[PDB]
Amino acid sequence: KTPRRRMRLAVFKALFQHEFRRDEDLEQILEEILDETYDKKAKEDARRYIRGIKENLSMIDDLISRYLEKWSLNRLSVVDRNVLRLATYELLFEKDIPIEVTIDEAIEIAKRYGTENSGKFVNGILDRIAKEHAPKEKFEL
């Protein structure tokens, strides 16, 4: 019922809003965005995403940094950095989602909230990260 797309957008919001509330807890902000309009399934998925991102934040950031050919991670816009994080987390840890879906949905968040070049920017980076880091079983999907 609650679209997976909206669930993922809730995760992105938490990430975005946490950059301005760092001494608060990611999980806390998530619980603010999550209200009675989000399915049980959506609340559980979003919570998994946030816990997984927090637990793997260093590894995820270091992975993205490896594929940045221009500005460093800290120098990207808040939207671009967090889109890359979310999409990288989903590529690495969410088994049921095809690569193309993760990247396409990431591009749409980028296009909607970022700069004019955000969509192409994240597309390029995620294409490379997926090719070399998506778990092998995903290449069946």
UniProtKB/Swiss-Prot annotation:
One of its GO terms (cellular component) is cytosol. Keywords: RNA-binding, Transcription, Transcription antitermination, Transcription regulation. It holds the Pfam family NusB. Transmembrane segments: none annotated. InterPro entries: NusB-like_sf (IPR035926), NusB_fam (IPR011605), NusB_RsmB_TIM44 (IPR006027). GO terms for biological process: DNA-templated transcription termination; transcription antitermination. CDD domains: Terminator_NusB. One of its GO terms (molecular function) is RNA binding. Belongs to the NusB family. Involved in transcription antitermination. Required for transcription of ribosomal RNA (rRNA) genes. Binds specifically to the boxA antiterminator sequence of the ribosomal RNA (rrn) operons. Monomer or homodimer; in equilibrium, with a preference for the monomer. Dimerization may be employed to package NusB in an inactive form until recruitment into antitermination complexes. This is Transcription antitermination protein NusB.
